Design a protein around this nucleic acid. Sequence first.
RNA 1: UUAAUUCCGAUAACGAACGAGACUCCUCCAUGCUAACUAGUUACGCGACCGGUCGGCGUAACUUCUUAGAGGGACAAGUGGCGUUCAGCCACACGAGAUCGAGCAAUAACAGGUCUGUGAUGCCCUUAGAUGUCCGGGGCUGCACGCGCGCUACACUGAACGGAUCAGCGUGUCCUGCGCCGACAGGUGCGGGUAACCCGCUGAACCCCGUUCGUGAUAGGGAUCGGGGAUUGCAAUUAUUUCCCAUGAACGAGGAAUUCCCAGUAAGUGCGGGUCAUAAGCUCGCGUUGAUUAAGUCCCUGCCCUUUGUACACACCG
Lengths: 85, 134, 137, 182, 67, 59
Amino acid sequence: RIRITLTSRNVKSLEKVCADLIRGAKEKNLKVKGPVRMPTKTLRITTRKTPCGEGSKTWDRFQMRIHKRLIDLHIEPGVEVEVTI
Amino acid sequence: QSVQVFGRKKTATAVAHCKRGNGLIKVNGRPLEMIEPATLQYKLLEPVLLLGKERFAGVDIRVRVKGGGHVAQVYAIRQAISKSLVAYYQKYVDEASKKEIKDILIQYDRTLLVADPRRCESKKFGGPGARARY
Amino acid sequence: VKDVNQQEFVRALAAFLKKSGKLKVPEWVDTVKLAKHKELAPYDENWFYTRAASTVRHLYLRGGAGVGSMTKIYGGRQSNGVMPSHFSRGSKSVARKVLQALESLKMVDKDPSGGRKLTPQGQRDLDRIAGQVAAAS
Amino acid sequence: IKLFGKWSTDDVQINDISLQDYIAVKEKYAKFLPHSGGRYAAKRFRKAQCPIVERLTNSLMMHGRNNGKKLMTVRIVKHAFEIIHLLTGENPLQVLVNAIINSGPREDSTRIGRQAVDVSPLRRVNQAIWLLCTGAREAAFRNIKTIAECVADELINAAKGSSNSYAIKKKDELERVAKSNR
Amino acid sequence: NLVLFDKATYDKLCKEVPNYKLITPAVVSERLKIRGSLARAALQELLNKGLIKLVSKHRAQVIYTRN
Amino acid sequence: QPIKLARVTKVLGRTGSQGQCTQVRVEFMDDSNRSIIRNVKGPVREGDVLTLLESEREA
RNA sequence: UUAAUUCCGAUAACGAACGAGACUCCUCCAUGCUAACUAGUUACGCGACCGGUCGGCGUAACUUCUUAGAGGGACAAGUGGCGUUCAGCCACACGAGAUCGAGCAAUAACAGGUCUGUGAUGCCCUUAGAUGUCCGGGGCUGCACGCGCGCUACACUGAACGGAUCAGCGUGUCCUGCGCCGACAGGUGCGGGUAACCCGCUGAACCCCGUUCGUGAUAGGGAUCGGGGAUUGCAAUUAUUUCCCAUGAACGAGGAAUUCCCAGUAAGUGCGGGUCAUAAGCUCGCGUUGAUUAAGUCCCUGCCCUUUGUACACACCG
């Protein structure tokens, strides 16, 4: 049993390597568990727009989403892969 | 022979497990008339007082609730119980009895079978809440 | 303990717990207030029996609570004067001494995983009182 | 039979033909509780279909202290109807609808920069509930008399035109101003 | 205002209050000039005897009536 | 003079400095005649019944 | 006519571009797919209690609830009415919805803010008895006062005391669970979690249900001070915070004025993040409870456009 964790910031490139991992391992007659989609994490950073104190209290909100998908069986830039036992 | 229908308030998700048997209606193991807010006790009994106990005397209902507040769970429980009987009368009873139940629950209050999409709005900077400002 | 009103359940269970004169009831039950966010001591003289009846009732519903959980269960709002009010946990020693008192009655034991759970004897005693409140209503 | 639980919704007649359409009581808006939350603040004339027992409940949450506390005001209206039925053997729902009949200003004055103008049938019931709840609220601000007693006395005096109701004194005040400025 | 009943006040409570339409610890406190604490505990005694009934009991609202 | 009871038939427009009074042509219900015009304060729509305390002047 | 130089229409204009819109992220459903021992349900056995309860234990069915991918769904589409029967509006049926909330945001302007955010920077100035730089101590907290954002109140629609019962956002190498000690604040040992795994089923508050309090400057209000216990840190005195006892002030809805706001909105209520060794009366978010009024108008106050006038064009600060 091997659990493959896949974490990326873009779902398109994360599911692209996820489909190729399932399809690439399904042809080897390996019983694999479907892609378990972990709850997405949004890294919130609400900063002050102005570099001084004269702005009209205008804040800018930033987000950095980290999608996590794990594959349990029995790579593009921006995707992290980590296999376990 | 059982269905599992959910009723959703703001954040209160109540799922009723309408299963054949006797007239049992419980929420998280506790009877329906034993929920803590007694002021909203009639809101939970509206599906029973309108449709009559004879329609519920053949199905057990066990509602599981989580999320929202006290009042949100009240409107989510009565909605789950209302739709669980409708979904039961649709898959195991004739469709004529389903319309006989829906027309009674819809004409009284549409919120028993249709959840309202009202949710809390996001707060904007420069104000204490969504609309209000400093 | 369900199928009955939980507010009259803790009042009848405390009467059974007081008539059965075996509870610990520490010496400082007359001086302590049940939380740092409370202004006065409990009005009722037998507050240790009322809290013990309610504490064993929470263990029936959610076992493995412990002292840190009962401190959160019995917490409430803390008035800070001219500052906004916040949530405040209850008393730790009051929650700890009331848990050990239930263990002396063999109604509570240490949970193997977490804190303390309910015993088959305590589950029986709570269901007997739950039957008395149902017949008396 | 549809009731609040003890008080029937039928046999509740409306005297004024104008307010007969803007008062939701009988045979179509009868509910066990004055609390449904039916999104009546959505369109122009949705509040006209809201039951007056719930509008009376919504108007009792008028202060920074009472905002967002409706289950309290439901208990207040629940206890007020107990006192109303106890003081007068008539139906408490009949006393509330009769209170709106007598607490609705028929005419009002507008400022010109006065001039007497008519009052819409919806503004009558809107202002009647506003005047009724304002009188019971000021009557219990500093008094041992509870709110359920003040609401009951505000409604029984308005349903009888006793001229002691805060709504009746304000309703006659707005009319006598329009009578001289017409 | 009055904290403890007197012979002229206690007899006034037991003869005419059970004849009132609305019996409440607030309405009997205003006409008998007694405080709410005494008016509340006094009406509980009349309920035990049987001179008055109980319409609805609550935290801050107790409504009594006549037999 | 009696309190006349009229019924709203047509909503003309908004009058007043801030548009608080609605100009409505309100006819009587006892007979089809007397389709007088009145100024109404509040939300008015076609079909409302007004309680005219004084119905002599048009204004 | 429209939220909109948005459109129709008029038409020496026709056809277009930026902005608006579209678009992006959001919540509202979809018992239809894709899948889940870091999510659960249900059926089962097991076992505690008197067929009901069990977040009390166990691995077979499969996705309602949970998570998140893809694809659907809503477009004034349907009906009636009002309209150059056009652009659109109003009212209804159906329906998860019949104007949802950000982000982005043109041409062009300010002598707007920022050299104290930058190893962005011109010039000037100081350059070793220094305006460099380090280490001590003090200050920015200093108080007859005049204002600006706020919190707490003036209670019975309430304070307390007790019972019961419900969140979501999010953070975590520090967050914290249990067993002991203490009245609290603390302490202590054993632990878990680099996290849908542990904190955590986030047992939040308001609220709800009992219980006493009874126009009362009062069991409203907890400001001002005293005496002690602790925690943070190298060190708190000008009290860092925190706890306990005591002290119990003004304040009975507030003058002329003035602010914000149209639906899950105002307001109440608590939580989390940022700041953070110690840390919220601030702010950025989150859920909870949940309205009154309004579907309108240029009356006021703000800008925009057209017309008009100009000796102005550094443009009336002319």
